[PDB]
Design a protein around this ligand. Sequence first.
Ligand code: CLA
Ligand SMILES: C/C(C=C=C1C(C)(C)C[C@H](O)C[C@@]1(C)O)=C/C=C/C(C)=C/C=C/C=C(C)/C=C/C=C(/C=C/[C@@]12O[C@]1(C)C[C@@H](O)CC2(C)C)CO
Ligand SMILES: CC(/C=C/C=C(C)/C=C/[C@@]12O[C@]1(C)C[C@@H](O)CC2(C)C)=C\C=C\C=C(C)\C=C\C=C(C)\C=C\[C@@]12O[C@]1(C)C[C@@H](O)CC2(C)C
Lengths: 164, 166, 85, 73
Amino acid sequence: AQSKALPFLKAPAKLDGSLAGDFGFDPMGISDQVANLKYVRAAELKHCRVAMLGFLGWVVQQYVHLPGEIYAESNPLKALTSVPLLSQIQIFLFIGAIELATLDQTYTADKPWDLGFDPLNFSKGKSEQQMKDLEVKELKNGRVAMIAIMGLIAQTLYTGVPLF
Amino acid sequence: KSKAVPFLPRPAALDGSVVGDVGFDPVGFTSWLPLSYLQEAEIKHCRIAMLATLGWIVADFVHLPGAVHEVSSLAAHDVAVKSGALAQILIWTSIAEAISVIAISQMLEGSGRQPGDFKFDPLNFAKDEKSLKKMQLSELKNGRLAMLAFSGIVTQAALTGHAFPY
Amino acid sequence: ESTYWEGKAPPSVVLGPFLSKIPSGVLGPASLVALIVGSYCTHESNIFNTLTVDTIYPAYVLGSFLTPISWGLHVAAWIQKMNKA
Amino acid sequence: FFSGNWKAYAQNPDTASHIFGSGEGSGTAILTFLGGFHPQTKSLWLTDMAHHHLAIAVLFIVAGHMYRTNWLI
Ligand code: CLA
Ligand SMILES: C/C(C=C=C1C(C)(C)C[C@H](O)C[C@@]1(C)O)=C/C=C/C(C)=C/C=C/C=C(C)/C=C/C=C(/C=C/[C@@]12O[C@]1(C)C[C@@H](O)CC2(C)C)CO
Ligand SMILES: CC(/C=C/C=C(C)/C=C/[C@@]12O[C@]1(C)C[C@@H](O)CC2(C)C)=C\C=C\C=C(C)\C=C\C=C(C)\C=C\[C@@]12O[C@]1(C)C[C@@H](O)CC2(C)C
């Protein structure tokens, strides 16, 4: 009834109105245990962004490579082992440096997903409806990418073909 | 008192439902289970049997967009579980049924979901209540006929080897 | 509710809202049939014919599971009979 | 497993001349009843313990549905 995604079920109590992308999709009632939807939305958006970047990297590594030889592997899962540990540890340290401040931030803030990242100011001057539309676009694209990046990983692990 | 069985009395739990309540429950199963759960099970069986009867009949006549699909809908099960199609259909069916547990559990508990209702009318074939009730009765009658017909089809196609007459 | 009881038999609510509505004349014979079927399945899988890897017979196994069940069915049959059902 | 021919996982167990950690005298079975001990290591058969844990897993997963939760049963 109240779920748009599952037009027959009634959504849970915490799925209503605000927090764009709310289509009443919580059949298992996971939202009933979390105190609020702030942390789960932060986790969902982090997954969405990481999955978008992962899909883009998957395709680009399929087609484009860095000039060096160590980056010449086309299969992303094989490149996970072919690439030297120095590059991967540098990436991990960069991510952890970004992650510790946001670790302090996420567990207490009202909008843990709002990291203040807008270098090009794509949101300055946008109205509330436009901002909500942008949030919906981001969430949609992220969910589709998550499904897609998991599918790419599965098909590479099951057939060895990294794409198509 | 019953409309279907004049001898036996009308079932206590069957008074009126647009699902085709003709008071046919000689064994009193409606006393055992909630009527809503039995209605959901009946509608699920109806839809599965209709799809299966149409698929069996069609796949014996024109079904070969490839090589592994050159079977006679009797050896099709093993061939296509070896191929892997039945695995995918089972995965999606399991997802749908796992969602259906909550749908069955949201009814029998409150809400307003009628048995067998999934709000799936993309083409809007039903417009008002009268059309909805008429076509619910039609769907359930067709589903019961399809249950019996598929039972006959499998029993005959296993008692012999033949085509559409079976 | 109030499954607690002190009389001769517990209230029918202890059977759950599926066995609370079965007449005792149905549960009784059903319990006896289930017990006989389960005993025969157990005695056919084992005892009369020794078990082997090639002979497991899910019917006899599933059947044998009706013996433990039978116990519950006739307990419920007695509970229904004593509760005027 | 999917075909129901579960006996196939018990066919051809480890022989009585199997050297542990080596392919000499080994088998292809993964779930068996053998009882007793390995003739070489004097310990329970690995296929016995795998079957034991599979049976325990099935039993405990079944028994974990006993108590009531948000789905009315
Ligand atoms: C990391 C994954 C992740 C996380 C944390 C969330 C989190 C959230 N989603 Mg969400 N979503 C995701 C992935 C995820 N989503 C994907 C991939 C899709 C596309 C199908 C969606 C589609 C979607 C819709 C349409 C809606 C939500 C909503 C919500 C919010 C409320 C539901 C809730 O509390 O569930 C928390 C979820 C988890 C804790 C995840 C548990 C992990 C389970 C067990 C998944 C198990 C695996 C799965 C079955 C199969 C994956 C394998 C492969 C096939 C992909 C919450 C912020 C609702 C909303 O906006 O509310 C504000 C809403 O309406 N989501
Ligand atoms: C690519 C391909 C195959 C191939 C090819 C080529 C590339 C094309 C050509 C080459 O030459 C060969 C080859 C092989 O490569 C395509 C495959 C076919 C597809 C993609 C079709 C799928 C069939 C769908 C079926 C059969 C689903 C059945 C429905 C059920 C519903 C169940 C329900 O119970 C549920 C769960 C809820 C209930 O309420 C009611 C209902 C809805 C009835 C199952 O009962
Ligand atoms: C990357 C992406 C968006 C990236 C946006 C970025 C970085 C924007 C960053 C900024 O805005 C901020 C944040 C703040 C601004 O102030 C600054 C900038 C910097 C401007 C979306 C991708 C979104 C990506 C999506 C939605 C991908 C969907 C993929 C699908 C459907 C793939 C399917 C398949 O892969 C399978 C599954 C199997 C294959 O075999 C077959 C096919 C078909 C190829």
